[PDB]
Amino acid sequence: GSSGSSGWQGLSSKGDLPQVEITKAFFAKQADEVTLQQADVVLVLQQEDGWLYGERLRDGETGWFPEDFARFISGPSSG
The DSSP result for the chain, as a single string, is ------S-------SS--EEEESS-----SSSB----TTEEEEEEEEETTEEEEEETTT--EEEE-GGG-EEEESS---
Residue 58 CB: number of other CB atoms within 10 A? 14
Protein fold of 16-79: SH3 type barrels. (2.30.30)
Bridge partners (DSSP) of residue 47 are 52
Experimental method: NMR
Phi, psi (degrees; rounded to nearest 5) at 40: -105, 180
Q: In a 10 Å sphere around its CB, with 0-12 CB exposed, 13-18 middle and 19+ buried, how is residue 63 labelled?
A: buried
**Tally of CB atoms within 10 A around 52:** 21
